[PDB]
């Protein structure tokens, strides 16, 4: 999975 | 005469240039490659938050959101740039989200062949959209269309994604038929320009890959992380 997309979707 | 409700809500969600021009900021001579890269990265972050606020997209699971955004990030970046050229700026210059204007002369002298070609074809698409008198309502509707441009098969929630696709295309058609008295079928020609935008965004991916193989991009550039998602 795309950790960066998970990050920007989860918060900040 | 009555603009569809989908477009009204999307307009309400559109953050006017003021605020994320502001936030992107604070976050002749040769062109600053690295800070332009980080500017593109902040543009991508603002686009992801726009998507997060959108209808339907807000109801999907994070996996489907990831799938959708992975399918159109380059396309949305390129389309944002193209609409920035349409709405503002001259055709002897390109306007960047910070407010800086770069003249095509600077591009021709400083840029390599492929970046130069990409900027030129983006300007061609800009002229195309100007000829069809693209306006902000259509811009937000086409952004929404791009966001959901993925085939249902790759998603868990088919129902909502397909409802979104259908209603987005219906909204665009209704709006173009009622506000565009000219001849041509603006619906179809806008959709073919989206075809061209996707092709240009693929070319942009190739450009970034070329820069990556040469280790010419910053170490933690987010567009390069998206490029490598596989
Ligand atoms: C498709 C429409 C937009 C272009 C797409 C670009 C793809 C993303 C690139 C992100 C890094 C930005 C730096 C650009 C190159 C540079 O920093 O300037 C470097 C080039 C050098 O030339 P070179 O890099 O070829 O190296 C050749 C060395 N032999 O000097 C210039 O001429 C600078 C002129 C500024 C161009 C600005 C246009 C960029 C658009 C950014 C806005 C958002 C679009 C992003 C969509 C993905």
Residue numbers in the entry:
A (entry chain C): 741 to 752
B (entry chain A): 221 to 247, 257 to 459
Per the authors:
pmcSteroidogenic factor-1 (SF-1; NR5A1) is 1 of 48 human members of the nuclear receptor (NR) family, composed of ligand-regulated transcription factors that control the expression of genes involved in critical biological processes such as development, metabolism, and reproduction. SF-1 belongs to the NR5A subfamily, a class of monomeric, phospholipid-binding NRs. SF-1 is critical for development of the adrenal glands, gonads, and ventromedial nucleus of the hypothalamus (VMH), where it also plays critical roles in steroidogenesis and energy homeostasis. The endogenous ligands for the NR5As are believed to be phospholipids (PLs).
However, a small molecule (“6N-10CA”) that simultaneously contacts deep pocket and mouth residues demonstrated low nanomolar affinity and potency for SF-1. To visualize the 6N-10CA binding mode and understand its mechanism of action, we solved the structure of the SF-1 LBD bound to 6N-10CA and a fragment of the coactivator transcriptional intermediate factor 2 (TIF2) to a resolution of 2.59 Å. There is electron density indicating the presence of both 6N-10CA and a PL in the pocket of both monomers in the asymmetric unit, indicating partial occupancy of both ligands in the crystal. Modeling of both ligands is supported by the strong electron density centered on the sulfamide group of 6N-10CA and phosphate moiety of the PL. We modeled in dipalmitoylphosphoethanolamine (DPPE; 16:0/16:0), which has been co-crystallized with SF-1 before, to satisfy the PL density. The sulfamide moiety directly interacts with the side chains of T352, M268, and backbone of V326. It also engages a water-mediated hydrogen bond network with H310, R313, and L324. The DPPE molecules in chains A and B have the same orientation as PLs complexed with SF-1 in previous structures, with the phosphates coordinated by Y436, K440, and the backbone of G341. The strong density for DPPE interferes with proper refinement of the carboxylic acid tail position, pulling it away from the residues that coordinate this moiety in LRH-1.
